[PDB]
Amino acid sequence: ATMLGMPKEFLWGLIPGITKTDVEAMRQHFNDDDEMTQMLLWWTPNGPGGE
Amino acid sequence: ATMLGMPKEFLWGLIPGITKTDVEAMRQHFNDDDEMTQMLLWWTPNGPGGEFAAEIEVDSQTQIIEAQGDVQKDLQDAQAKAQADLAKQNAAAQQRQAVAV
Amino acid sequence: ATMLGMPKEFLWGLIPGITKTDVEAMRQHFNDDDEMTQMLLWWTPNGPGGEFAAEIEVDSQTQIIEAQGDVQKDLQDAQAKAQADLAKQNAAAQQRQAVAV
């Protein structure tokens, strides 16, 4: 994903331990407006980032 | 891909675990306009990048510029009031010393 | 390629898993105008680069410059109004003290 620029969404299904139902759940709730979800989405190593 | 500059699309098919149908699916949905797809396409290690981080940056800089403009505006208003009162008092003193005869 | 500066195109054929037909296909479709091909050609680790990141950068800087110009414009309007009223009051005071006779 970092070098060849593959779409990460397609690479989610190839990771062991994650099923396609979990992939769909991640897809539906990727950009939720909850504060926790937003902080996790913009999580820098030194705490939350973004807005 | 990094050093020899090979086309990455041709190198997708050589990676084990990815078939040519999956390669075609990646090709067709590479530049989708969905927010999730765009965030994944511009994914920096510290969260999404691209226009998503640009919006945050411009909002922050605009807020800072607006605050600086507000303080400059109040400074200019104070300067204008000071100049107005100074001119008024100077004119009053000049006319007061002129009337005396 | 990085140190001795060998031509990378000649080194593509020596990499196992890539045939000369694939090398020709890479040669013909290296600089395609497709958005996906251009993004892959300018792929930085933190998402696409090249003109795609340049557009984001120029949009951000243009928005910041526009906000700064807006605050400067309102400051200039306030300064112009202050100068206008100061000149008006100065002329009024001068004519008022001149009429007195």
Instruction: Answer for the pair A10, B27: CB distance below 8 angstroms, yes or no.
Output: no
Instruction: Answer for the pair A42, A49: CB distance below 8 angstroms, yes or no.
Output: yes
**Cα–Cα distance, A41 to C43 (Å, whole number):** 22
**Cα–Cα distance, B12 to C26 (Å, whole number):** 13
Cβ neighbours of B18 in A, within 8 Å? 6, 14
Tell me which H or E stretch contains A48: strand A47-48
**Cα–Cα distance, C29 to C37 (Å, whole number):** 9
Burial class for B39, CB neighbours closer than 10 Å (0-12, 13-18, 19+): buried
- Which of A32, B11, B52, B24 lies closest to C47 in space, CA to CA? B52
**Candidate from C46, C57, C71 with C-beta closest to B69:** C71
**Cα–Cα distance, B84 to B20 (Å, whole number):** 78
**Candidate from C36, C48, C75 with C-beta closest to B73:** C75
Task: Give B43-88 as a DSSP string.
Answer: EETTEE-THHHHHHHHHHHHHHHHHHHHHHHHHHHHHHHHHHHHHH
**Selected residue of B3, B4, B12, B19 to mutate for chain A interface (largest A Cβ count, 10 A):** B12
Beta-bridge mates of residue A48: A43
Is B78 in CB contact (< 8 Å) with chain C? no
CB within 8 Å: B69 and C64: no
Experimental technique used to determine this entry: cryo-EM
Beta-bridge mates of residue C43: C48
User: Which residue type sits at A51?
Assistant: E
Q: At A44, is the secondary structure helix, strand, or coil? A: strand
**Cα–Cα distance, B50 to C47 (Å, whole number):** 8
- Which of C25, C54, C50 lies closest to C40 in space, CA to CA? C50
Task: Give C7-54 as a DSSP string.
Answer: -HHHHHTTSTT--HHHHHHHHHTTT---HHHHHHHTEETTEE-THHHH
Instruction: Considering only the C-alpha atoms of chain A, give the largest distance between any 2 of them, rounded to a whole number of Å.
Output: 33
**Residue A32, Ramachandran bin (φ over 0: left; ψ between -120 and 50: alpha; else beta):** beta
Q: At C17, is the secondary structure helix, strand, or coil? A: coil
**Cα–Cα distance, A22 to A20 (Å, whole number):** 5
| Residue A4: partners with Cβ closer than 8 Å, 6 or more residues away | B1, B8, B11, B12, B15, C43
> Based on C-alpha coordinates, what's the Rg of chain C?
32
Q: At C44, is the secondary structure helix, strand, or coil? A: strand
Instruction: Answer for the pair B76, C78: CB distance below 8 angstroms, yes or no.
Output: yes
Residue of chain B whose Cα is closest to the Cα of C14:
B4
Is C29 in CB contact (< 8 Å) with chain B? yes
Query: Given in angstroms, what resolution was this structure solved at?
Result: 3.7
Q: At B8, is the secondary structure helix, strand, or coil? A: helix
Residue with tokens 């797809």: B37
Residue with tokens 């807005």: A51
**Cα–Cα distance, B53 to A42 (Å, whole number):** 10
Is C23 in CB contact (< 8 Å) with chain B? no
Is A29 in CB contact (< 8 Å) with chain B? no
- Which of B56, B49, B43 lies closest to C64 in space, CA to CA? B56
User: Which residue type sits at C52?
Assistant: F
User: Which residue type sits at B62?
Assistant: T
Instruction: Answer for the pair C90, B87: CB distance below 8 angstroms, yes or no.
Output: yes
**Cα–Cα distance, B46 to B28 (Å, whole number):** 27
Q: Count the alpha carbons within 13 Å of B27 in the hemisphere toward its beta carbon.
A: 15
Q: Min CA distance, C43 vs chain A (Å)?
A: 7
Going by the DSSP 8-state scheme, the letter that residue C48 receives in this structure is E
The number of beta carbons lying within 10 Å of the beta carbon of residue C4 is 5
Is C40 in CB contact (< 8 Å) with chain A? yes
Instruction: Answer for the pair A8, B12: CB distance below 8 angstroms, yes or no.
Output: no
Q: What are B77's two structure tokens?
A: 């208003």
CB within 8 Å: A14 and B17: yes
Number of H helices, E strands in chain B: 4, 2
The total number of residues shown for chain B amounts to 101
Instruction: Answer for the pair C89, B90: CB distance below 8 angstroms, yes or no.
Output: no
Q: Min CA distance, A34 vs chain C (Å)?
A: 25
| Residue C96: partners with Cβ closer than 8 Å, 6 or more residues away | B95
Q: Min CA distance, B8 vs chain A (Å)?
A: 5
Cβ neighbours of A49 in B, within 8 Å? 46-47
CB within 8 Å: A4 and B12: yes
**Cα–Cα distance, C79 to C90 (Å, whole number):** 16
Sign of CA dihedral C51, C57, C63, C65: negative
Going by the DSSP 8-state scheme, the letter that residue B15 receives in this structure is S
